[PDB]
């Protein structure tokens, strides 16, 4: 509870464990691998723009790692951006923000997947 | 029975491992470690061989009282450490660890137990502070590890943490007597003397011990696995010293002055010879060992 | 702004316009372009250059044989400093592999020449090419130094096919 | 240890070097620093590569006043080891990093932490540089990365940092030190030559852990299909070579190294320092071409 | 005379490590198993128990030729000590959640304490598995 | 008599001769239950050698003189003198929660309650039964439950301030020390049972491998002595010992050195009058 560390594990699970029970799942193990990769080469927009509001669609996994990956960043312990996310989208937010706070947030998102690359691939 | 000591500090300048021998333990090759607390130390008998080492492969002169004497000589150093004695040396303890920091990349962590142990050490040689240890979870009035208010993040964790007002706090005190006292008279060294100043944090004794024990450094050797201390640790450490063992007064060398004890003249050779850098622990082929000894 | 770049925070959108950059692996992966719903050449030849001298006083004269045998994003092997069109680095040893299996998985296993040339105790060694023509080579809709016997012969013939 | 000096080492290969498991981002991940997290290449890799590098070399060199093929097996294992070796290694640390520039096409960056521990270790061994490390956010007088007047951007991210104004400035005498230090004295690959008198780039401690934490290569790969890490191209490191006097008991036993005009130390200086190749490969997986880096003796 | 708590915690270590050598040395990948033993204090030191066990579980292949088998038994061994070594510390949540969910939900000195139990058993298991297995 | 503790600031090492066992030059054990103790001709020595060597001035009965005498200190307690076995009352083992902990059992608490009846000294209170912790305890996880080394143990604590065990720990806390071992002193406190504490002194000492293997007492010990009184001093006569116990408890010094390898550091100790 403590520890940053074991702080995202408790979230990555629970996020996991939602993948489980939809239709397509096998692809959102897909998305989950390709994500870090993806943002160390506006990733996030790529995801936003794929995204399809039905539940029997291969567009439903951007529908939930978008506003999965957005809850994280409204928890975040340190704290980097919490009100600006009240009232806007992850990519109305991310582009309102100066080179520092890029910085904040481009390590903390591409840390939680680390844990969700592990626990995506032990249950699903 | 010692009748002088003097404190004196070792500063690592690349990753010291002075082996434990063999144990059980997890890794390979483990570091040292006292039985009852798992802190890190240096055993005497190995920093006494790395001094003697120093001291007797050195040639140079120095002035002992009133007589001109070179360091290399084999007699005068067989009448000081003894028969291949009347110097001696304590186990070297653990009192700066680094730990790495979201922000300023690296910050030192010390506990109240290793401050009170300094202090008590520091009584034997007759040296007063002049001001109390401070308290759980205090860092200096100018630290700059801070990030969103209060809260500090080393490691993977997150300690609450009260700075300090007024500049006339133990810590601050500390912070500025460690600065003061633990590097030479300046030379060209601002970068660490101004950083010790602002980047010490003290934590609860059971967080440096969940430290310290899972934060060594590990390498991989070709296999078997060794443990190594970081660079940048601060340990500290005491001389001691005694009147020569000898019957004869020509015996006894330079050390039987006219009108000054024993004692005096072997702490006066000691201190005003020492060199600058000594090499400690194994595995010295390889560039592992290196420290800095100040005396002070 | 938004739509267009969907980058350059407020503090990288000024002092930066789209046609005033000079890396190409920036240009075409670090600003994409979003729809809505879906180089000077002394460079060229000095890196080259530089990349043919070490090899050569690295490795034997003898050893290797150059054969010439070649010419934003959105769903490009570019040089990740360098940004530059020829970076294979392992594609080379790739396509020999997959053209030497295709043609001719135990009778690939049985044969001592198919132990060391594409060996799996690694004995030739393949390097990465680079430009030799300084070609703008837009996309529109040495490449082999392998060193360490006979071993161009066969990547030559796997390359043709 | 009586005698000791510092020898660079600059790729012009992806150079890997890998630390057990390390369950992280990257399958493969290189050895980083535990307190810093910089990257490093630990002091047995160093030498196993140099000494590789030795062996399989031929030539004939002069020490004092003999000759000897450096490839013998005589002398060999009185420098090197098998009696613990009278020729050791430090570890390798990092001191110049590139990252891509916008204008410019590549810039290099360091931090002053970087800096000062560099000139600290120099000082061990009898050099002293003779001005002073800049301070942080500080580039050469004349650089090229400039854009929109003092502003400067590496990456996606900006930056501000400030000129010099004369040749006094401490960054120009660091900057005008490595040109003279870091490559050959003669011609060479001087396309770079003034591309390092021109393009250093001086960050805060900060900036520059997350640059060398997040700017690495990722060449993926399929076998299986994991990624891995790469230090980028034409990276610079450090480190220092050290020396004491042979370990045998008979005059005999000493081979070339004892002579009757000079101590034991500077004849295994002379052999170090005249005996090894401009050009070596460390590393791994270089079967794939993987890993070239230059070595230069100061 | 009764058995000193010194001794009757180590006669179970070493039963219990000795069993499980035995059962990984069964399957059809022993080697892999040896392998594998050796490696987990090592990542335990350098990462911490919740990472290394959750990338264990990471590699946990379903069939039981196949070269993954040996993690899921691991998996599965050091699940059953940890109900009974600490004697009720985390018993309560490995009854109907995953070990690893239940090793991410707990405080500072559960974790060191857990952390020391599973060392304490490796230490055997290791010790064995390098003897009964060639 | 004057019950006078001893505790260790180094590692402590009184040379046993030898041994055909694991350890190469153990220490010196009582002789059929295996606590650690020192040898009473290795005590006095120490206490001598830091006599001869202090120099001070004190007032005893009338006259006032400098322990330098030669013949103060040739008359007084040895060249037969009016002025025991050291012996084990505390000793530290490492614990999951608060670094170390502190443990005795009911019997050396009981040798304990006999050696201090000769000086008159009474505590009060009954010593505390086994398996029992101070109230204000900081080595509890999961509250009914401690972790020595790589073990649980099973202990209750005291309800109330009037129990054994937290009046033991004052006493100790205040009667002990002339801060912060103070205050941590009066909170870890542990009495495991007594089987279970013969395997800790026996498999938890300290063993320095310089090949062969030493072994000292771990620091932070506390033991405990006895003694006991019955020219420059001579005076009308020698009231009851009023004379030679007051010499000794004026002269003490504060830091004493004992055992081998004193060269190298080891071997110091504190020195308190009850």
Sequence with gaps: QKSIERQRAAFAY???????????????????KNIPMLIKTATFAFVKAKS????????????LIYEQTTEWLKQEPKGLIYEKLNNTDMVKALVELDSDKYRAVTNEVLALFVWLKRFAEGLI | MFKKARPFFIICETPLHCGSGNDIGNVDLPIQRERHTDFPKIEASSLKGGIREAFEE???????????INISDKSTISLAFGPEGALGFTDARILLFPVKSMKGVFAWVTCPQVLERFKSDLNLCGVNLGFEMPQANTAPKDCSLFINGNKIVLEEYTFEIARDRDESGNCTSLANWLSENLFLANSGIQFWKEKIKKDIVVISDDEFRD???????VITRTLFTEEYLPTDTVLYSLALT?????????????????????????????????????????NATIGKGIARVKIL | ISG?????????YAAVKPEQIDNFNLLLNKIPYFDGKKYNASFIKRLS????????????????????LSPSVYEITLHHIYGIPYIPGQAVKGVVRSWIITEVEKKALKDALFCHIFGSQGSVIFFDALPITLPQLEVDVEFTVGMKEIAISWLKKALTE
């Design chain 1, 14 to 32: 629970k996020c996991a464990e939602a993948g489980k029970s939809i239709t397509k799942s096998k692809e959102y193990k897909a998305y989950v």
């Design chain 1, 52 to 63: 399809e509001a039905d539940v029997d669609k291969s567009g439903y996994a951007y529908k």
């Design chain 2, 58 to 68: 050195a040639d140079k002169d120095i002035k002992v009282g009133s007589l001109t």
């Design chain 2, 211 to 217: 430290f310290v024990t899972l934060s060594t450094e």
């Design chain 2, 242 to 282: 005694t009147p020569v063992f000898k019957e004869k007064d020509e015996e006894k060398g330079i050390f039987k002055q006219d009108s000054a004890n024993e004692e005096d003249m072997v702490m006066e050779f000691f201190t005003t010879g020492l060199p600058e850098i000594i090499q400690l622990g194994g």
């Design chain 3, 4 to 12: 267009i770049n969907y980058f350059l925070p407020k503090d990288t």
């Design chain 3, 49 to 68: 250059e530089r990349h043919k001298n070490s090899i050569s006083q690295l490795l034997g004269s003898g050893s290797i044989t150059s054969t010439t």
